[PDB]
């Protein structure tokens, strides 16, 4: 029993984190095989941050301008190239702790674990979701750029995020591991703002199923709504509309509890219109939307990893 | 910026988790040097759980009754002994991934990271606090016994908790690594209940300082209370009393924000008597008490580990 914000074990990722220094700028890099991945703005100075020309800045650099450290061992850079907003540093030594990995781009609403690092040293791990406005509500300080987000499928590490910058509203933006930004953001210190965020409805429903599994049932009722009558109320409260695919994803949770998806939607509709009236659900007084249906199944059924 | 439930990187602990089987019972073990630590109830059957005599049960066992697996490698048990509620299995191979470690017993109110495991395989990591009633609000399923809690100081792993059982109210109880239970619990399936829980006041104050650092200031005021006038209100709402040592611990947070501790206590006193009125603090509609003053400093100043 119980329900926690659970992150993946970070051991397989800790061994891939390195320190990358170019000039007086130092951030984190991802060392896989003989390639080190890091944000390309590591080659920027104070004069370039507002209007950088990464083509010019990179052409004026050589391999010896990049200092890469794996703990105390120095990695000799034997080549460099730029793929979108990510810099790829070819090194002479292949990382012997390279796990089975792949590069995946996630969708809004999906969750992943973040290994926050500083000077190539892991500092902490936490779970977060990609928001519908393509930002994440992370916890990052100065020097955290290059920190990566990941999921673990069986024995394979799926890298999905590399941290690049913090927006003025305190939220964070980054790219996938191919260098392509999540959302309409660019890696230059211009006045960029994120669009309006919305609540991930399918995640709230999955979180309500986790509550029923753990004994919280006070919000239930015997009513039933349709998918269109629910979406009319949901859009009023800035909730993402619910689709038939979302219903099918919630299948296993509905079977384990014996509560149909449209039944639970009627309970969520009541919680949106009347509030929670000082009561709590799984120790929260707000509706949580950063647990996917898979996160609930994994935590309420117990699947490990190799 | 930002504030998350952040756990320690679990890499150094993942390499110490093994699978321990005795009869038809399988749980997790901690492999440090040539010793494997696991809960002693692994030697119990169905007939013994309600009234076990661990002296008799252990004397009727031999070294070959214990099957220890580190992944696929089998560890030959060359000796066994019992220290309080923990079984110590001497094996022929010393764990080459043994980090610098120590065994520490934590106090109520302190936090630690939990590496939840099943069949010796890590499944997830999360942060939790030792409650004033010596339980933890964990997330554990069947087979999680032997999972350990830990903190990381510099390069040293401080083990502080080993999971033993879940109580009927859904909370969890365990021992330190010397086998001594936290709280008045025993490892037999009798009807045990935890005492009344209270809110960790010093942790709430530390969490309020984290909010001010991150831009949440709506709850502040210019009033100031005394330590005794605050404790009179706190005990009314089942809050732990505040001591002068708690004030000194909050020193660095008060200096960084320029808000005295007694000033913040006046704000907490108002939040307890009037509620939050539908407003949120750091994305929560409740007062969070599972962040220590050290957790806030570490996340709002960025200290890594070796
Ligand atoms: O999330 C964070 C990250 C963070 C941090 O280390 N930064 C801020 C972003 N910065 C940067 C430099 C150049 C360019 C373009 O040349 C860009 Cl776009 C960004 C690197 C240093 N500080 C925080 O406070 N929070
Ligand atoms: O936290 C958890 C742990 C858990 C779990 O694996 N257990 C439950 C406790 N159990 C046990 C066996 C014998 C004795 C004394 O002989 C005792 Cl005290 C406990 C071992 C198996 N299942 C859950 O659902 N939650």
């Amino acid at each position: 029993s119980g329900f926690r914000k659970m992150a993946f074990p970070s051991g397989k990722v800790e061994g891939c984190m390195v320190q990358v220094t170019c000039g007086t700028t130092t951030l984190n890099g991802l060392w896989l095989d003989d390639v080190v991945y890091c944000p390309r703005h590591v080659i920027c100075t104070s004069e370039d941050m507002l209007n950088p020309n990464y083509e010019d800045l990179l052409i004026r650099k050589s391999n010896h301008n990049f200092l890469v450290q794996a703990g105390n061992v120095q990695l000799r850079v034997i080549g460099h190239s730029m793929q979108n907003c990510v810099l790829k540093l070819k090194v002479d030594t292949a990382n012997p702790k390279t796990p089975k990995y792949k590069f995946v781009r996630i969708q809004p609403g999906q969750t992943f674990s973040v290994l926050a690092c500083y000077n190539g040293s892991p500092s902490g791990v936490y779970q977060c979701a990609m928001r519908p406005n393509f930002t994440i509500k992370g916890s990052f300080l100065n020097g955290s750029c290059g920190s990566v987000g990941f999921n673990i499928d069986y024995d394979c590490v799926s890298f999905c995020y590399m941290h690049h910058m913090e927006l003025p509203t305190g939220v964070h933006a980054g790219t996938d591991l191919e260098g392509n930004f999540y959302g309409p953001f660019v890696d230059r210190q211009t006045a960029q703002a994120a669009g309006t965020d919305t609540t991930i409805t399918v995640n709230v429903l999955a979180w309500l199923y986790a509550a029923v599994i753990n004994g919280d049932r006070w919000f239930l009722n015997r009513f039933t709504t349709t998918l269109n009558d629910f979406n009319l109320v949901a859009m009023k409260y800035n909730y993402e509309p619910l689709t038939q695919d979302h219903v099918d994803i919630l299948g296993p949770l509905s079977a384990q509890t014996g509560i149909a998806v449209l039944d639970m939607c009627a309970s969520l509709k009541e919680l949106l219109q009347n509030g929670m009236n000082g009561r709590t659900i799984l120790g929260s007084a707000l509706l949580e939307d950063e647990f996917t249906p898979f996160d609930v199944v994994r935590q309420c059924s117990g699947v490990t990893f190799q």
Side-chain angles (χ1 to χ4, degrees), chain A:
Chain A
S1 302
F3 204 74
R4 284 285 187 173
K5 277 281 178 59
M6 190 171 303
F8 289 98
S10 64
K12 292 197 174 72
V13 181
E14 289 167 61
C16 307
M17 300 310 300
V18 296
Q19 182 182 221
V20 180
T21 298
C22 181
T24 52
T25 298
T26 296
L27 43 73
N28 307 278
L30 186 64
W31 182 21
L32 299 171
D33 298 319
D34 58 354
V35 180
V36 171
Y37 304 81
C38 67
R40 71 174 173 178
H41 69 63
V42 68
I43 69 179
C44 287
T45 70
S46 300
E47 296 264 316
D48 319 278
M49 284 143 54
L50 298 118
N51 188 35
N53 199 136
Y54 292 97
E55 254 68 41
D56 289 313
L57 297 175
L58 188 59
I59 230 293
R60 301 162 184 172
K61 297 269 155 48
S62 39
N63 289 338
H64 70 82
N65 291 123
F66 299 100
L67 300 173
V68 181
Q69 296 188 12
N72 303 281
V73 174
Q74 288 237 160
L75 296 180
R76 186 172 67 97
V77 178
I78 63 179
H80 59 278
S81 61
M82 188 172 63
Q83 180 175 336
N84 301 312
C85 302
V86 158
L87 190 66
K88 300 173 64 179
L89 299 179
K90 179 71 87 62
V91 295
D92 63 334
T93 309
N95 185 10
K97 302 184 180 185
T98 298
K100 184 177 182 180
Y101 71 94
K102 58 182 177 178
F103 292 166
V104 302
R105 185 176 179 94
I106 58 166
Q107 294 289 151
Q110 297 190 258
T111 57
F112 58 99
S113 300
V114 171
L115 183 60
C117 300
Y118 302 91
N119 306 288
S121 298
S123 178
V125 60
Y126 54 88
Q127 190 86 347
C128 66
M130 177 67 65
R131 303 305 307 178
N133 64 4
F134 292 102
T135 70
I136 68 174
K137 287 182 167 297
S139 180
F140 291 115
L141 300 175
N142 187 76
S144 60
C145 297
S147 298
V148 300
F150 65 96
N151 289 286
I152 295 183
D153 298 75
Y154 306 109
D155 60 336
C156 178
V157 177
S158 300
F159 293 101
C160 60
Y161 178 87
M162 172 173 287
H163 185 51
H164 281 249
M165 68 197 194
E166 175 175 316
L167 294 178
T169 48
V171 296
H172 303 101
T175 71
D176 59 17
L177 270 297
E178 311 284 2
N180 303 293
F181 256 101
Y182 289 98
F185 308 113
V186 291
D187 52 349
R188 50 190 250 255
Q189 291 197 358
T190 170
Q192 326 178 48
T196 64
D197 203 17
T198 54
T199 303
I200 310 157
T201 307
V202 63
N203 285 6
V204 176
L205 291 175
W207 178 73
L208 292 177
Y209 277 105
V212 175
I213 297 178
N214 279 274
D216 274 336
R217 305 177 58 96
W218 63 266
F219 53 87
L220 293 176
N221 52 35
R222 38 81 103 108
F223 307 107
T224 300
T225 183
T226 58
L227 196 54
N228 298 123
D229 283 290
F230 175 79
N231 288 329
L232 288 179
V233 169
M235 289 159 50
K236 171 77 174 187
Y237 294 87
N238 215 42
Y239 271 57
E240 288 286 292
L242 205 69
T243 68
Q244 178 58 40
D245 192 11
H246 294 155
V247 173
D248 300 334
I249 294 297
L250 298 167
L253 293 181
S254 177
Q256 180 179 342
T257 62
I259 296 175
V261 178
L262 281 311
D263 280 1
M264 193 69 72
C265 290
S267 295
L268 177 54
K269 170 174 138 61
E270 204 64 34
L271 291 176
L272 292 181
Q273 293 174 152
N274 306 332
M276 295 170 60
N277 306 152
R279 285 164 264 275
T280 61
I281 298 176
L282 283 176
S284 175
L286 298 176
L287 299 177
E288 179 67 57
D289 77 335
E290 303 223 335
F291 292 98
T292 67
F294 174 80
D295 299 332
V296 174
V297 169
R298 183 169 52 87
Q299 191 169 169
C300 298
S301 294
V303 173
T304 50
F305 310 96
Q306 268 51 56

